[PDB]
Amino acid sequence: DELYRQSLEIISRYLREQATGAKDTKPMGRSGATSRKALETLRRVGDGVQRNHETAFQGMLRKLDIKNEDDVKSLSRVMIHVFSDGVTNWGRIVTLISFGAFVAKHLKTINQESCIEPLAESITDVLVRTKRDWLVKQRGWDGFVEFFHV
Ligand SMILES: O=C(O)c1ccc(-c2cccc3c(CCCOc4cccc5ccccc45)c(C(=O)O)nn23)cc1
C-alpha cells in the first residue's frame, strides 16, 4: 500500500506541525517531491479552512469529547459516517485533514501530544480505505497539489 504510506507521511507531519507550530524536520525515507509540495499546500489552504469552519469544528470537537488515546482510537466510525455523505472532492479531503489538525492542536492543549501519531494513523486509514478508487483516478497527491496550485 504505497498510497497509505505516502498519505501517512504527509498527514502525520501536517498534524504535528499544526499541533507544535514547528516546521517539521524529520527526514522521510527518501526524496518525496510531491509529498513536500502536498505539505506546502496543506500549510497554505488548511489554515483558512479552519478559520471558515471555526464554529462547526468546535461543535464537532465538543461532541467527540476527546481526552485520551482510547478516545482517539474510537473516532474511526464517526469519521467514516460524516466523510462518506454527499460526494467526493478535494475540498472535503482538505476538511478531513484540517479538522485532523484542529484535533491535533486540541491534543497538545490537553497534554496528550502522544495521541497525535495514532490520530494521524486513523485519518490516513479512513482516507485511503473510503476514497481509494477516487484518489487513484485523481492521481493521488499530485492531483491534490495541482488542484490548489498557486
Ligand atoms: O454544518 C456545517 O457547515 C458543517 C461543516 C463541516 C463539518 C465537519 C466538521 C468536522 C469534520 C468534517 C468533515 C470531514 C469528515 C469527517 O472528519 C472527522 C469526523 C470526526 C472526527 C474526525 C477526527 C479527525 C479528522 C476528521 C474527523 C466533513 C465533510 O466530510 O464534509 N465535514 N466536517 C460539520 C458541519
What CATH number has the domain bearing residue 90?
1.10.437.10
Residue 119 Cα to ligand 1 midpoint, Å, equals 14
Structural domains in the chain (count): 1
Task: Give CA–CA dist 8/122, Å, rounded.
Answer: 9
Question: Are 61 and 106 within 8 A, CB to CB?
Answer: yes
Kindly state if the Cβ of 100 falls inside 6 Å of ligand 1: yes
- Residue 80: phi and psi, rounded to 5, are -55, -50
Task: Mark out the alpha helices in the chain (DSSP H runs).
Answer: 2-20, 33-41, 47-52, 54-64, 69-72, 76-83, 90-109, 116-137, 140-147
Resolution (Å units): 1.9
Range of the domain at 59: 1-148
In degrees, rounded to 5, the angle at the alpha carbon of residue 34 between the alpha carbons of residues 28 and 38 is 90
**Distances, alpha carbon 8 to alpha carbons 33, 62, 88, 124, 138, in Å:** 15, 26, 20, 6, 18
Q: Left (φ > 0), alpha (ψ -120 to 50) or beta: where does 90 sit?
A: alpha
Q: According to the entry, how was the structure determined? A: X-ray
Residue 25 Cα to ligand 1 midpoint, Å, equals 28
Which three three-digit cell numbers place residue 2? 504505497
What SS3 class is residue 68?
A: coil
Which three three-digit cell numbers place residue 124? 490516513
Which of 51, 73, 99 is the pocket-test mutation for ligand 1 (most atoms within 8 Å of CB)? 99
Question: Are 28 and 35 within 8 A, CB to CB?
Answer: yes
Task: Give CA–CA dist 77/98, Å, rounded.
Answer: 18
